[PDB]
Every structure is written in structure tokens, then in C-alpha cells.
Amino acid sequence: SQIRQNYSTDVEAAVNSLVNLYLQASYTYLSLGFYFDRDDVALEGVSHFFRELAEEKREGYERLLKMQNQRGGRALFQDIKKPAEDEWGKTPDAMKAAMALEKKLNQALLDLHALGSARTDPHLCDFLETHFLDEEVKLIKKMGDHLTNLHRLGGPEAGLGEYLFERLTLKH
Template sequence: MALASSKVSTCSSLSPIVGDVPKKFISSMSFVLSNSPSSSSLTLSKVGGRGNLMRVFASDLSTPLTGVLFEPFEEVKKDVLAVPITPNVSLARQNYTDESEAAINEQINVEYNVSYVYHSLFAYFDRDNIALKGLAKFFKESSEEEREHAEKFMKYQNIRGGRVILHPITSPPSEFANVEKGDALHAMELALSLEKLVNEKLLNLHSVAGRNNDPQLADFIESEFLNEQVEAIKKISEYVTQLRIVGKGHGVWHFNQKLLHGAE
């Protein structure tokens, strides 16, 4: 509320009486309430025979003091809020660009491809002539986690009114033996590179959300994926370090037992 003494009204121009106000609450004889050029003017005058009261007059109380009137039935007439009547068109879609939709489908493909590689690693370490059950367990769980991520993105695509398009998945290798490093270290370094790749793709997707002014997509990526991804990178980095320390010999078996029994 702003006081504007230059626009004080006089008693002769005011109607009707708003009410009586105790004099002790009045700091001046007259004032104007103004929060817009069309605000009502108020003035105060003494009431005859009642020296302890002031009378308040208003010239116009028809204009809302806030200057804002929400009219929902007028607002919904905007074209952008119209409900589609064309068949096979999403009713839920709003502020969701084609670029964002395509980027989500690409991320689904990334998650499925990484899941497929991890599943191949699971099969490799589960062989009878490899028999590292702890590593097999780790990569099977990693594969399932990446598939769950893909399904999260698919569900989100449907929530926003996009259409899920599944792209082809590249066939991963089935052999992971490495004479120099050993298969355990070689596989874990591959996993670390894949997790960093996924993180890079997630950050690119977040950039798409920002470029298209889509805070809801940005929030989804931040709350569901980004922190979890850096934690995965940290964990696998530690595994790589531990495998480098133990080398290719008996220490790999102990590392495998740690993964098998869930020890940190």
C-alpha cells in the first residue's frame, strides 16, 4: 500500500461512508490508498459531536485492490490449453517439445545397450571355466538396474504425452579375457567407462531440458538419476582400484567373494 498525498479527495466528492474508525489509529487527516492508477481514494473527517471518531469516505471501491482478477473460463480459451480432438494425439502433452521426446527415446536406447553389455558380462563370469560368481552377480544386478532405468524413461515418456520408440540394440561381445590385466579388472574398467558414458548422456539430456525451457524434465533427471549416477561411478572406481592392487592372482578370488556375499 502506498500513500499519495497529492491525490487526496475532499469530503464533498466522496460517497458512500465506509465506516467509523477510532481516532487513535489515524496518523493523518486524509490519505489515498493506491496500488494502481485506478485505485480508490479515501479521506477522513471528524464526526460532529463525537470527537473521538473519524469517518472514512471512499470515492470508488469497485476496482479490486490487487488489480488482478482470475477468470478461469476465459483463461482456458487459449489455444495452447485446448484439448485435442484428433485421434492418436496425446491429451496430456504440454510444454513437451519434439527434441525432448526424441532425446528421451535416445536415452532409453543408451540404458538398454548398457544393460545388454552387463548381461553379457554376467554370462561370461557365470561360465563353468570362469566361475567368478560374485562378479556374475554384480553384473547381473547392474544389467537389471539399467533396464529399470530404461523403463523409468519409458514411463516418463508416456506421462508427458510422448511416444516411445525403441531403437536397435548393438550386440555386445561375449569374450572378456585379457592377458595383460586379467578378465576381472578388464571387465570392471569397461563398466566404469560405461557408467561415465551414461552420466555424459544424462547431462546432455538435462541440457535439452534447459534449452527447451522444460523444468519438469530437468527435475525428473536430477531427482531420479544424476546423484545415483555419480555414486555408481564412485563405487566402481573403488572396485577398479582394488583389482589393480590385488593383481591377477589369488586376490581376484577374494574380491569375487566380497561381491558374492555383499561385503563392502
């Protein structure tokens, strides 16, 4: 590139990888989104929650792609692996799947910050600090709070709790 400066081939390839990971997470959220709208699941607020996460994740990869172009990197796409399940169980299960996905995304973000820090790339570090890390922290805190409210509503009287949580906590 006529423009590339302080932009290591390692960051470029790790950014390409994080992009595939965002694409895959978006895809997972899409699947959870339509799943909770099945006539036999029918939890509109849960469906909305996950549709919104698919949308947020898309913004993630679009922003990584834009930063790749701005630094003089070359985007390279791989296949997007289908989501890990085709049925997602009940709200607690789905929510725990989502937690696990967000934890993996967060680790991948932290790993890429560590790497850019190690290649003294402060622009890349700042970029992640600004557009990604706090977003992850806030979102994980929110899923944790959700898991705590579902747990409190679970046990013997499981079905009623799931209805109430979707109705009184999730936006529909």
C-alpha cells in the same frame, strides 16, 4: 496429445535415444553376467554384480518410458546393438569396460539435462536430477573404488587377488 505441455519434440527424441542406450547397457550387463558364470571363469560374486547392473539398467529404461507416456511423448524403438565383446577378460578388464559404459550413460544423462534446461523444461530436469544423476555418481564412485582394490591386488600375484576380491568384497 490432449496432455502434452511444455514437452519439446527434441526432448521426446532424446528420451527415445536414451532409452535405446539403456537397453543396450542392460544387454551389455547381461553378457558380462553370464560370462563370469562360465565354468572356465567361475566368479560368482562378479557375475552377481553385473546381473544386478543389468536389472538396474532395465529399471532405468522402464522409468524413461513411463515418463515419456506421462508427458505425452511417443516411445519409438530401434534395434539393440549387441555388446562390444563376447569375451570379457579378467575382473579388472570387465570392471573398466563397465566404468566406460557408465561414463557414457552419465554424459548422455548430463547432455539431456542440458537440453531440457535449454528448452526450459523443469519437470524433465527434476526427473533426471531425482531418478538418475545421483545414482550414476554413486555407482561410478563404487566402480572406481573397485578398480582401486583390484589394482592393489594385481601385478605378479594376479590370480590370487582376483579370487580374494570376489570372495571378500563382492556379495555372493
